Amino acid sequence: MEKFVLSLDEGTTSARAIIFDRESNIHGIGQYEFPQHYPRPGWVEHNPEEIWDAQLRAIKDAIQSARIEPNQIAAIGVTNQRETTLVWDKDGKPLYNAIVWQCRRTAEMVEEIKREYGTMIKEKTGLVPDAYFSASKLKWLLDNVPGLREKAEKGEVMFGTVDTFLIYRLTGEHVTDYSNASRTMLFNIKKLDWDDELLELFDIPESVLPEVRESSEVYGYTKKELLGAEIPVSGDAGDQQAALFGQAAFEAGMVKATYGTGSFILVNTDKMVLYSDNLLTTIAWGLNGRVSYALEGSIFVTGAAVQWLRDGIKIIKHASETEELATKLESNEGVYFVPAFVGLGAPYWDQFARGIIIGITRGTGREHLARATLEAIAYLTRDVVDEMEKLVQIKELRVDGGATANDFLMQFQADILNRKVIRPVVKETTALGAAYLAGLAVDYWADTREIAELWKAERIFEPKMDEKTRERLYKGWKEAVKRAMGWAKVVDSA
Amino acid sequence: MEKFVLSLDEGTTSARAIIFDRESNIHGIGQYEFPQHYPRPGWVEHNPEEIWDAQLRAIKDAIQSARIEPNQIAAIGVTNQRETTLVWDKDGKPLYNAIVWQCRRTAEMVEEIKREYGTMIKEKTGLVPDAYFSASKLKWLLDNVPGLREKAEKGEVMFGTVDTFLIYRLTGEHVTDYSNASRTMLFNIKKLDWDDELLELFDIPESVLPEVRESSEVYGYTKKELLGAEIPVSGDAGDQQAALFGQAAFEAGMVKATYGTGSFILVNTDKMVLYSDNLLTTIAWGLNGRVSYALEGSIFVTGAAVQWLRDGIKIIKHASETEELATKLESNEGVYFVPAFVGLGAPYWDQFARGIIIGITRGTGREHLARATLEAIAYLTRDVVDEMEKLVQIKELRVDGGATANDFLMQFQADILNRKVIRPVVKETTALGAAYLAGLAVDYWADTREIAELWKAERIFEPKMDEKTRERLYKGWKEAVKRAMGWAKVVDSA
């Protein structure tokens, strides 16, 4: 009887489940949104019970839609939004909301630390000190949740990133993989272990920490009842590395970009550890006793600028609408939108940037905003790829996320880059990457030589814009960006 | 029989006629929009026959609804939009479209002249060289309209602002008053005559020029055909100065702001000629052999940023809705909209500034844009008033235009200025000033002293905002303005 891999993609706004076959075809999808909690300006929280309930409901639909029995699921892969920090008790009940990777409550605290400790943290961690990472968020939780520092000091608090939470709830194990752990700013990526000086700096009791494992490994087994069969949980990577793995990006020098709420661009650097003042050195995955590294640019707001057109000012009914508006014009006509809704990530790392639409005139319409938002998404990607090029060659880009279906966005992307932008036949690249990691671990697949042969270019966009136009459109953007900078640090009237 | 004054208000978008009595109650209005020609972005023109068509229909409408015979009209006053340049032949046929005050076609050519001649032009004219003014709109026509230059060196082209145009058609006289001529950037406001060095500098045959007369003076009579009587044309001034005169601002130190498409604030400086590097010294009016001067700040886009909300990104149906939207929030929450659609007027004079919305976050909605737009109209006013305060006390603002019906806007205006903002009973203050000007010429009113008692206050908005808050709101606005500067001279397109 035919078996399949189940994969959880617990994203920032939606918890999803995709059942895959050994050719990497999809057989079932469940997806459910759960609420975003904005308790204060620039504070973002998710409720961990709503995550789970959405994540469960999603598994059942994928199963149902695929019409397999539970017994036909060989392995569960887990993947997740990365920096969102949870804490829960032995019976597994949250001691607060998750502080999301998007949340900035720690910005002033990290700004001070960065000054005196920036280089030390970067050398241990690969990371640029920022509110984005777990470390400062655990600290804030420990100092602000009434009686959790004391409970954690009693060895009664479990910390995790989202993969950890989901694996706990599924198997009762307290673990994370190297990739999600590289993201906490507490984990030493050269030594591959929790870092003592860092636990001190942030005042972290160690009892709180999960055990760090590889990215492909049986971590545990599901109660038969949750799902009806007892299934191995065997794959675990942060979502943006799982999309790297989902893209078959298995050799050093291979680059993907995923477009969602934000956009994240990873080059696989393999056994090599590469340094960049303005990008992230991160772990890709741990597989077969070996560790792959990666270089990342993390761009916090890309598709969220399209959500904002639909939901904030409501100039559109759907994201789909953005493309036909945009293509109503033959250029941006001097209109630019730097959507720095809360600061800029890579490579500017300005916690104070805010968003700006500049170049407005009497004729600025819905079409110019649609276009400026789409092009922003392409400029932000280049800001990162150009910084990667200060040290390493970036040939071409493999891409994924809903936005990749927008052909205007995709052609504008290859055009301002002067690089091929390639979308594959599989869509759920993030899900498929956690599936491959799990499948590998119970022999559902034999090796990555095998898996590599499963990957296919659906379409390849080729650059066809000339230098003068590239350079002039990008020079507008660069100038637009300067104007977004520092804004939350002159104003508040906020 | 009972007798009335009819005044023409030939606005930027609309042609209007109002019939008034000695008490200044309005017995009848006509009003008609006419077409805005934007042949090329940044270019604005009017068709003079459409302006005439609309003006004459409004006259006949006003007379209609007053239910008077034309012999009941003691005098006509004429006010107009102010810098718009017409040219026409001896039979009175436009030799070209009107180049509106809005039109930026000459920006670069003026930009150039500003380095050799800014001090000499300001000295003569009170004006900051800007494409705003007549001079260069007249060079353009002379230089680019085929055969117009040669026809003019032969004496067959008449130039005029819209007052001159209209009086020519009503009367066959070719005249302007002091206020309109001061706007040409071709008239010496100190000597009170056309100026030879500017005529030379702008390459302008003197045969083009009308005779400069006072603002309350019988110019000519209307043809008995036209309107059925032989009616004296006896008032003429620029619209913005006539609003000054209909606000009864006869004493030096009295100040008004009119709100329309753009905004203009004038203080009556009386018999003094005041200098300011960043505002316009102009002529208020010529009356009984005396000339009153003024200090002005001109702001190109204010109400137009509201039209953009409605016609550009279409986030409101009716300009009405903006108050209701703005008042849904308690502050702008760090959101500013510098609507410098066409560059900035006084005190900045940056022809390259473009519109910027800054401080955009995921929770920025239609209400933040509505509120940001309203507050911009009050901020732009304060930029000018503060620039005037560097020379002269500005005590309070008498205020007119349709936006003065907006209480959030009016109260916010008193608020950031910390000054009273006083809205009179008689709404149609522009037409009113030309009515008083024409009527004084013909003894329909004895005195500006008699007329002064006709003015009564309908509502005085009084400040009630703390220094700390007024200062913070405004510090944000200035930082936003800085970020609007100079955009167009780096983005340049298509």
Side-chain angles (χ1 to χ4, degrees), chain B residues 194-484:
Chain B
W194 302 109
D195 178 279
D196 284 328
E197 321 197 81
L198 281 353
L199 264 10
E200 192 183 331
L201 190 277
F202 282 101
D203 203 2
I204 282 160
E206 64 189 341
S207 23
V208 141
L209 307 153
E211 214 198 286
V212 181
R213 302 248 228 134
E214 302 205 277
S215 317
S216 197
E217 182 179 305
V218 183
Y219 305 112
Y221 293 89
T222 60
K223 275 303 232 342
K224 203 176 229 166
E225 290 61 72
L226 249 84
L227 267 18
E230 233 156 37
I231 303 155
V233 200
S234 33
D236 157 31
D239 51 10
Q240 299 313 330
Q241 27 282 87
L244 196 55
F245 202 86
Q247 287 286 11
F250 305 125
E251 292 155 38
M254 303 188 60
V255 188
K256 67 87 199 181
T258 306
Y259 295 76
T261 301
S263 299
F264 312 79
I265 299 106
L266 285 74
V267 218
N268 195 345
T269 78
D270 175 65
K271 289 197 145 211
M272 299 200 283
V273 188
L274 292 196
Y275 310 140
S276 175
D277 277 347
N278 308 123
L279 302 173
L280 306 175
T281 304
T282 45
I283 291 188
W285 44 79
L287 166 88
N288 312 309
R290 299 159 67 266
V291 174
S292 295
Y293 296 90
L295 206 54
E296 168 164 353
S298 308
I299 304 163
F300 308 153
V301 178
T302 58
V306 184
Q307 302 289 48
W308 185 73
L309 296 186
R310 187 209 55 211
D311 293 327
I313 40 55
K314 318 169 196 63
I315 65 168
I316 69 200
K317 200 87 58 191
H318 287 82
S320 47
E321 319 181 348
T322 314
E323 196 172 354
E324 310 53 52
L325 295 166
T327 55
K328 298 198 208 153
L329 319 168
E330 325 264 79
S331 71
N332 62 38
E333 292 163 1
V335 184
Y336 295 88
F337 179 12
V338 187
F341 292 167
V342 291
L344 284 155
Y348 314 108
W349 306 99
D350 186 352
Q351 306 176 283
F352 315 135
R354 289 311 181 261
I356 189 193
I357 296 170
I358 183 157
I360 304 171
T361 73
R362 118 220 330 141
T364 293
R366 314 195 153 195
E367 41 286 296
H368 298 74
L369 298 192
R371 180 155 184 139
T373 299
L374 304 189
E375 286 191 12
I377 301 182
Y379 300 126
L380 276 324
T381 305
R382 176 161 167 182
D383 298 355
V384 172
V385 167
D386 276 354
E387 194 75 10
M388 296 173 164
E389 283 271 349
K390 305 154 48 177
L391 314 64
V392 68
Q393 181 190 64
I394 285 99
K395 153 174 159 200
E396 63 186 19
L397 280 196
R398 249 110 128 142
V399 109
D400 46 83
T404 68
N406 195 321
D407 309 318
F408 165 82
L409 175 73
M410 295 297 106
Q411 179 71 58
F412 182 92
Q413 187 58 281
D415 287 347
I416 26 89
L417 249 21
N418 195 212
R419 277 178 262 233
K420 288 156 198 204
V421 156
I422 297 141
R423 158 165 104 184
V425 163
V426 170
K427 307 294 145 214
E428 301 274 352
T429 265
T430 296
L432 221 215
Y436 292 156
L437 247 9
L440 269 323
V442 117
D443 261 277
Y444 190 88
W445 285 280
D447 269 318
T448 58
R449 165 133 201 163
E450 165 183 0
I451 287 172
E453 347 215 359
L454 280 25
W455 187 96
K456 85 150 92 51
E458 176 258 306
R459 176 150 180 214
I460 290 153
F461 294 80
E462 251 170 62
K464 43 186 102 299
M465 159 184 289
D466 194 329
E467 206 50 23
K468 136 233 332 218
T469 306
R470 151 162 69 246
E471 293 308 291
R472 194 211 335 126
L473 293 192
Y474 191 69
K475 200 247 197 196
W477 159 266
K478 314 206 297 276
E479 284 309 297
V481 181
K482 291 195 197 166
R483 282 158 189 256

Side-chain angles (χ1 to χ4, degrees), chain A residues 2 13 32 37 62 83 187 192 195 234 273 289 326 335 349 384 458:
Chain A
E2 190 178 342
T13 44
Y32 281 87
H37 295 99
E83 273 80 3
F187 180 87
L192 299 168
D195 181 278
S234 87
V273 192
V335 182
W349 307 99
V384 165
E458 164 217 299

Side-chain angles (χ1 to χ4, degrees), chain A residues 422-439:
Chain A
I422 302 113
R423 36 165 223 247
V425 170
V426 189
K427 281 335 168 196
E428 306 301 340
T429 251
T430 298
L432 221 214
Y436 283 157
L437 243 7

Side-chain angles (χ1 to χ4, degrees), chain B residues 137-151:
Chain B
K137 300 152 147 39
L138 221 200
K139 210 185 175 257
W140 197 89
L141 291 156
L142 291 177
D143 290 8
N144 287 95
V145 180
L148 191 98
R149 180 167 288 290
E150 289 73 33
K151 175 149 192 70

